[PDB]
Design a protein around this ligand. Sequence first.
Ligand SMILES: OC[C@H]1O[C@@H](O[C@H]2[C@H](O)[C@@H](O)[C@H](O)O[C@@H]2CO)[C@H](O)[C@@H](O)[C@H]1O
Ligand SMILES: [Cl-]
Length: 137
Amino acid sequence: LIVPYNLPLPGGVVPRMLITILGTVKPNANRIALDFQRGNDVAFHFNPRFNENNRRVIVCNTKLDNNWGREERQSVFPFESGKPFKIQVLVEPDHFKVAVNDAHLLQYNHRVKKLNEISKLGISGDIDLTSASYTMI
Ligand SMILES: OC[C@H]1O[C@@H](O[C@H]2[C@H](O)[C@@H](O)[C@H](O)O[C@@H]2CO)[C@H](O)[C@@H](O)[C@H]1O
Ligand SMILES: [Cl-]
């Protein structure tokens, strides 16, 4: 698949929806980004950074009216340059739950409450993208 990739989420997200992203991190990767969009707003931005001041960190945030909010940062970093990965985002009633390579990584409390209007997922960054899909569990 071509990156950046736009995956429509028809009718928005709903609890029990599972989004699975398969790809490979490029050897000299700097960033990965998943952007769950509500129009121009970003309900949930998931942003692994491979070199923020020579540390690897995951930054999560929400963008409202073109303004970023308070960042939530996770120092646990399961990605590795050059290696294949699986990201799974499970929508639960109160949070997005993210697992990488079948291991729980983090939860992100819903700041954007109109889940049915979060209708696009943008996938970008230094990856080869193999598959992006969703299903109901
Ligand atoms: O919060 C997600 C958002 O971060 C922006 O970068 C921030 C950076 O994380 C922060 O340390 C600095 O003080 O401000 C920057 C600008 O708000 C990224 O530019 C953006 O792409 C998102 O990743
Ligand atoms: Cl809202």
